[PDB]
């Protein structure tokens, strides 16, 4: 009886005490796995972009058979977006686990070391397979679809705000009581292996007396899709509504989501989606709805079919 | 011993079973107060705008001495924004209480009737004075600064997510254990009595691979101020950052807030605000930071002084 | 249209029990509803006999109906739901519902809650998910569901693992199902039982008396659940009484007064050494339900621990 | 630089008690720190004698220092904090701190928590806010603070009314202060007491035994707090025992096992008729603290109710 082989892919700086030398910062890692590190890119998470996403997904798909699991170290600001992109595009059913740190590795009571430890525990556990892309933060295993950051600074910020966590980790053991029902990874039709770019999808915000200029600027630039961060149950300020209604009639894909941090933007409730050709995002927040819309646009431009995609993934 | 006189100002449709005839939908109101209703405007809350705000504040300031308290019925989508605008601009220290309903007045288990009842209870209670503008929803008394909507459909959606509620209502009695520390109402310098318009402030969203076109569109239109809904602790995608940095150097006021639903966007932590001339929003979310920025711009265009305003109100 | 049976255990939650279709006419559009009053008791006085009656009724009537809705007061809903979750062998939907506001109150919650419970019981997708609680537009599993606030209409939450689904306009978006075994996958069978093992609960706090625990032991209780402090720790005096009782054959489960999170095995207390069982995410009242049932099968602590790891 | 005294009640929370400035060197930049070991006990074994000792020490040493930080285990922190909140007469900051992870663990929380507690005790703005608990970058009042999760570093929350302030980079943004009276505005004075009235807690649940409650009554306890179901309701057998005890002069407080919300007076139980007291937002363990103190002044239920409405 030997240890699993886990690869750590880094996207940025170190979250505990180079990527080569993590087994020296956290020597406890040796007792759980044989670890190898690769620096895939080196960027701040706030600057995350489509090229990095494509690079990551291709790397995991290509190296899937060379390792028992993956841990990806990633900044916290856009973790939730990269996790969902990977959840839809990775075709490997071995564990893929993302992890970060809310405090810098040099600060007192840095969270990164224990988070990294727990991420490797999770990647090494056979029970973690077939659950989609996972985020491990603060002793908790979270699915890539529902996970979001709820507080600007709290070490406990990452939560699955609509449907809850998959499991909790205590003393290196995971109690899994849930798995996601929406389709992920190998069960999706999305395949990015041949793609060098993704459809252009932007996000506009709604609020009192909202300007329509952001929306117009995107339409005039020929964006493929626009996600509205609506008020309440995905409602839109009138000027924004008028702009997006005309955009949707002339070929732009329009998804109604919500600025409100929990709950679904429901179909045909507040706005007659069938009349305008809009798609309702359900529980996906604006930034995650963008991810799914970009992918849906690689397969179809028909709002009816896009809506079905939002109801399945 | 007689009952207080409470005025109900409506901004839209009825939240229980015209505004004239509310005492017939909720006859229990008669036992608590002598009620008078006025329809101030009639618009959907998603279409809320600066003109309505100015109208409301002027009406309350003008009628303050004619009544013992005010209840304003308002749609839920933008309640949080109107509440904070009033919290900063009303000069009456009698109770001003906003209320709405998450379910339509015709549906089974409509929440509006009991919410309206409780709002009048709150407006009638002497202990409610001097606490700023209040929101009463779901048996809870919430301050206009911290209150926000947390779920798209839940009757329990309104919460003061950073500092908690002021009081709870049980059987027509309020247990107040808190009052807001930030300055409000009569203690602010903001005076809208002479104003027919407010400075133009827009909001842009950050996310992976964020377009700078929304921000550029606002700058090119000559907006007075721009609020960034940043990632994490108010961070900005690089293209957005570059656009806003140049805007701030050339006279546009720029406030960093966060798309993350709780916690403060803190000063000089993630971004060197002093170098770029940016202002950090603290706990104010993007839509509320817009409210304060619009008002601050009536007094000053200097980022240092704007920052002090964000630290006091 | 499906045939749905409403079993009442107390008062009416909208506007007795065949009145319901008159109080909530909209029910006729979604199901053919029949009602029976099984008992008439306050939820605060809920007891083992009512539990046995309910489970036998459902098990016996399973073939005659397409789903069950049980009307139940809110105070102890979470206990009954878990009991039924472990003992019901019908795989048709069983849905519990109640109301936080009286049916005569302004903005009473019971009518819409009842409507949504019937919706849930009528949906094919609800089957095989265990016993469910439907409150405030949300569908919750009977194991994790608990009341979090004394008065709020939104009180019912699955505080460790989340809800199964949300209901909007009569349609349910299910994204979860419980992994722990339930209903027809458990070994527990109450069909021939007229009583259950005696299990009590003691609370821990600063300067706690051991007298409650001693009282239960002297009365020959079969098991004792401790509502511990933090991660299931015990006040010294209480610990000593329970350690002794475990040696003489009383089953002892460490749970926590803390409202979320697991009481984990062998972390704060050497469970193997004293013959204690750790409750996991089960709060004290739920841990009682499982221990009662466990004790119908075994008195061995290691086997009871295994049960607490599977159900 | 302010002079801050660290009073320890148990183990060390970073890397005994004069070591602290060596374990957390950054403390030297913000205060002149002195440490004293007051007792050395596990938090789960916290008791009335430790409480009396702590309050007398602070009251006696108030003039010699600019603020106090008390190091305390997490299990019962919420009880000690409320006791001190009612009995301390020093108006200088008193700040409690602990750690959810052992000081030797990876990513131990105690060092930064200790640093933030000293920061808080050193800030002028912290005075006159009552006794405070500083955990996970947040400043919480001793009345409302409770532990919400068995293991999470973020467990401590003021679940009904929220935190007072948040700490970022050594600065505190205070937006709240507690309205209920505390510290030097209470009538409670423990300076001449060597013991406290005897108050125990019983739990309610389905089929609850009255034996715990009877045991406390037979031992002549001065008061009993009920952890009720829902809005402080009681299982029938328990109710009957407590109704009898209240008539013979035992003080009885109805609280709730439900983790948030008030137990409200005369709503679910006719408190006036039975001579019971409703706890408001005080959970059972906190309601014990107040009832113990109330009973040093009066045995009359109407006066005890007034106390529960003011403190």
Numbering used by the authors:
A (entry chain A), B (entry chain A): -1 to 15, 31 to 326
C (entry chain B), D (entry chain B): 1 to 15, 31 to 326
What does the paper say about this structure?
Three structures included in this report, referred to as EcAIID90T/K162T-L-Asn50, EcAIID90T/K162T-L-Asn56, and EcAIID90T/K162T-L-Asn62, were determined for crystals of the EcAIID90T,K162T variant grown in the presence of 10 mM L-Asn at pH 5, 5.6 and 6.2, respectively. All three structures, refined at the resolution of 2.15 Å or higher, are isomorphous and belong to the space group P3121 with two protomers, representing half of the biological assembly, present in the asymmetric unit. We found that the structures are practically invariant within the pH range explored in this study, both in terms of the overall fold as well as details within the active site region. Therefore, we will describe only the structure of EcAIID90T/K162T-L-Asn50. Somewhat unexpectedly, we found that in all three structures one of two independent active sites (in protomer B) was occupied by a citrate anion, despite the fact that L-Asn was present in the crystallization buffer, which is illustrated in Fig. S2c. The position of the citrate in these structures differs significantly from those observed for EcAIIwt-apo7 or for complexes of EcAI. In this case the ligand is stabilized by interactions with the affinity His6-tag, contributed by a symmetry-related protomer, therefore the observed binding mode is an experimental artifact. Under these conditions, a citrate anion is partly (pH 5.6 and 6.2) to predominantly (pH 5.0) mono-protonated on β-carboxylate, with a significant contribution of the doubly-(β1/β2)-protonated form at pH 5.0. Although three conserved interactions described earlier for the α-carboxylate group of citrate are not preserved, this moiety still forms two H-bonds with Ser58, indicating importance of this residue for ligand binding.
